[PDB]
Every structure is written in C-alpha cells, then in structure tokens.
Design a protein around this ligand. Structure first.
Ligand SMILES: [Co+3]
Lengths: 201, 219
C-alpha cells in the first residue's frame, strides 16, 4: 500500500543524475544561466508564498474599500500589496459567503495563483484531488476535516483558461478589532484554496 | 487530446493524501528542474502551450508513475529535441555537440523583473463575443488529437455564461504554430446534475469552467 499516483510516490533512484546531466548540457550550450536559476529558486523558496495571500485577505477583511477594489479587479487589488507576475497575471478573487463556498482546482494540470499562494502542494497537482473535486466536492472536503452545511452551495472553479483564482475566506467569528497582522495569521493556505477554513480563535 | 491528463470525473485514484508541513521542494533535483522552466521560456525555446501538450503526450503510465517535476523533466528532454534546440544524441550523451553556441536570455539582472511581470495571455482585439452573461450555452462535442482546454467532462453539456473575461490567446492554435487567434473567454456554470446525472449529484453544487468562445454554441 505505498503511494503510487497521489503525488507523493518515490521518484526513480537515478533522477538526480538525469537532472544534473541535462542541466550541465543546457549550461554548456549556453541556454541557461545557473546564477539566474538560483534567483528563481530563492524566489519561490523564501519570497513567494501563502503569507502573501494572507495579507491580501486580512486587508480585505478590515478595509471595505479595498475589498470592493479587489473583487472588481483581482490583479490590481493584489498589486496594491506588491504582489504580481508569473501565473497571476489575470487574477479573479472568489468571495465566500454564508450562501456560497468557493474552491478551485486545475483538472487539466496544476494551474494555481503563484504570486499570492506560491507554488502548489503536491496533492493539488495530483490525480486524486483533480479527478474527484469536480464530481464529489463534499466527499473530498470531508477528507480535509471540512463539512459544508447541506443547504450551503459549493462552487468548484476549474482553472481551464488563463484566469487564476484565489478564495477570499469568510472572517472567523470573535475576531473584533483584531489588527490586520493578527487576522492574517488565521488565514491558512487551505482557506485560500477553498479546501479549508480560517483558524478559529 | 483525450489523454490520461484529462482527469475530471475519473474514479479509482483514491484518497487525497496530503503531506503535513510539506516543503516547497521535497528534493534538490526538483529545484534544478523547476528553475529551468523560466530560463527556457525566456529564451523563447517554446511557449507554455506547447509545454502543456508535451506533458499530455508522455506515456500514460509514465505520467501516472512520475512525480510532478518528472513531467517537466520529460518536456525538457523531448520538446527541446522536437523544436530542434537539442539533438537526441546531445540529450542522450549529456555532452553538447559544438560548445557555447547560445547566450542565456534569463540573466541574474532581469530575474526579479521577469518574475514580477510575467506574460498575460490577454490581447487587445480578437473575435467578437457571441454570448452575454445569462446566456444558456452548450459545449461543442469535439475530440481533437491536439491540444485543447475543453475538459472531457463538459462536452455536450449545457451551462450558463456567468462571466465574460475578455479577449485571450487560444491555446488550441498557439500550441501547434497556428497563431494566437484571440477570442473571448467565458466562465460557464454547470449544475452537478447536468454533469454527473441524477444519482451522482448534489442539488446545491455547481461547477465553473473557463471556455473559449468557439468551444460553445447557443443551447
Ligand atoms: Co494546471
């Protein structure tokens, strides 16, 4: 019962060698620049991640004017906080309401809002989540410890085009006059994908 | 392409296992593979649509067995040969054929600027929009062997246009050197019942999919 196709299975024993060989070849031909590649890695290891989206959500929670702007134009909205670029060029923000619960997926591959959430986790890119999310949202969500009220509508957004989606979670109850910073700590990656809820105080 | 990659609605893939406290990169080789993508895209060695379709064209078993970044590694070893940037020999030997004959476009000086800017697929002008939000539409039954973005589970199904996102590049043509053919992209809403049938559905649930203008027809 090892992992096989859920994204966490073991890579081939020689994978590192194959990668090292291609890299050397590409550098040798002058197609890639090692120094520039290190900067790319650093950017997604240390600079771009869910903390970005968290700041976006937190700000929308406390600032109604910003929220309105964000929902009208996601790209400009997230830019106000200095977030933008690859895989986030055309953002659409999905507002969770008492009537609607949003969650997104890329059934066709792995499309995901890089600038605000960083690179996707292995499970988001794998068959189990992608295959089932569009047919049985509740079944999948239950595996994440999240049960949606039966009367509450679930909206699954499939990222088939060049639009990129991020979920604006509902603000947890009992968080009055919380600072933007304290509110941001409640916003998990899952809560912004739609596969979870913000932490409750 | 009706390939293994089109997973929407499939059974038998099992539970969604999720590693707790998962790192951005689980192995070092992943870092190399991941950082190669921007470097090669910047060179203009290939476009993102040809990239996706390269992955769609790997063996079904290899696609399932392979971890995510093996998918990418496959593209680099194969799509680069198809495009004639490398030879099968160069790619097999590991050793180049005539030395430093190109210059990397992605240099340290422009990394941040490039990553912060990206490349929108939105275009100024293209085909006129045939549909308005509220319109009932039916996804055309098409089965191209080439690259397409209308998921198999939507074909023939009827939905409601809920958003007109404006004009965008069409991947179907961009992936096969037939130009961008810009046209409108809509978000279409389908009911759970419409997609999966009376039994496998929930009354409140809906699925939204982004489809190009000529993917559709009036219901
Ligand atoms: Co994708």
């Amino acid at each position: 019962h090892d992992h096989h196709h859920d994204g966490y299975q073991a890579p081939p024993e020689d994978i590192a060698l194959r990668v090292k060989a291609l890299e050397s070849l590409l550098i040798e031909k002058g197609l890639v620049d090692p120094a520039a590649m290190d900067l790319v890695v650093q950017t997604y290891e240390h600079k771009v991640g869910p903390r970005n989206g968290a700041k976006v959500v937190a700000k929308a929670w406390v600032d109604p004017a910003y929220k309105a702007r964000l929902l009208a134009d996601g790209t400009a909205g997230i830019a106000e906080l200095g977030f933008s670029g690859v895989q986030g060029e055309d953002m659409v923000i999905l507002e969770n309401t008492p009537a609607v619960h949003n969650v997104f997926v890329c059934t066709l591959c792995s499309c995901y809002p890089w600038p605000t959430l960083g690179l996707p986790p292995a499970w988001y890119k794998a068959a189990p989540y992608r295959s089932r999310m569009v047919s049985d949202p509740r079944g999948v969500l239950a595996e994440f410890g999240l049960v949606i009220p039966a009367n509450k509508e679930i909206r699954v957004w499939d990222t088939t085009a060049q639009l990129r989606y991020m979920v604006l979670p509902e603000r947890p109850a009992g968080t009055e006059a919380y600072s933007e910073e304290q509110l941001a700590e409640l916003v998990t990656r899952d809560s912004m994908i739609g596969t979870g809820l913000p932490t409750q105080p | 392409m009706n390939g293994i990659h089109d997973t929407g609605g499939a059974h038998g893939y099992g539970p969604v296992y999720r590693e707790p406290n998962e790192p951005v990169f689980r192995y070092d080789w992943e870092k190399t593979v991941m950082s190669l993508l921007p470097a090669l895209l910047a060179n203009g060695n290939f476009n993102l649509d040809e990239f996706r379709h390269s992955i769609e064209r790997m063996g079904p078993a290899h696609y399932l067995e392979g971890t995510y970044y093996e998918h990418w590694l496959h593209v680099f070893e194969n799509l680069l040969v198809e495009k004639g940037v490398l030879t099968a020999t160069e790619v097999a030997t590991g050793k180049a054929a005539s030395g430093k004959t190109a210059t990397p476009v992605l240099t340290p000086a422009i990394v941040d600027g490039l990553l912060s800017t990206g490349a929108s697929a939105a275009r100024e002008e293209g085909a006129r929009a045939r549909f308005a939000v509220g319109d009932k539409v039916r996804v055309l039954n098409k089965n191209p062997v080439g690259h397409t973005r209308m998921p198999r589970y939507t074909r023939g199904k009827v939905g409601t246009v809920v958003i007109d996102h404006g004009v965008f590049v069409t991947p179907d043509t961009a992936a096969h050197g037939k130009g961008e053919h810009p046209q409108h992209v809509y978000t279409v809403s389908f009911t759970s019942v419409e997609l999966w049938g009376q039994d496998a559905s929930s009354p409140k649930d809906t699925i939204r999919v982004d489809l190009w203008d000529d993917y559709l027809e009036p219901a």
